[PDB]
Ligand binder design. Structure first.
Ligand code: NAG
Ligand code: NAG
Lengths: 49, 49
């Protein structure tokens, strides 16, 4: 499966098992026994006006 | 804030550590804990902060 969304640059560190914070607590949570990969990249040229 | 060579130290006591009040105020670029898991911080009490 593939999941996609947009966050800040300082909130990419929260997409990881065992993390705390607003994004992990209220928006998107990962299992402890996760098997997969995480990918991120900057999108200033498209998502900023 | 102080200079790095003359750094400052402050004592904290008799308080309730609800760090959810910082969510709308601050954005952090680095957060790392060493002797404790970040998901267990809501269930503990701390001695000599
Ligand atoms: C969160 O902070 C923003 C910017 O200071 C403010 O406009 C907004 O009203 C705040 N939200 C709450 C619920 O206080
Ligand atoms: C610091 O406190 C002042 C009020 O004294 C407030 O206006 C300001 O937004 C606060 N800054 C942060 C980032 O918490």
């Amino acid at each position: 499966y593939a999941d996609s969304f947009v966050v800040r640059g300082d909130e990419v560190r929260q997409i990881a098992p065992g993390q705390t914070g607003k994004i992990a607590d209220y928006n998107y949570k990962l299992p402890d026994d996760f098997t997969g990969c995480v990918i991120a990249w900057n999108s200033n040229n498209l998502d900023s006006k | 804030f102080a200079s790095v060579y003359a750094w400052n130290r402050k004592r904290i006591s008799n308080c309730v550590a609800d760090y959810s009040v910082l969510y709308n105020s601050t954005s952090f670029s680095t957060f790392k804990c060493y002797g404790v898991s970040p998901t267990k911080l809501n269930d503990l009490c701390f001695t000599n902060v």
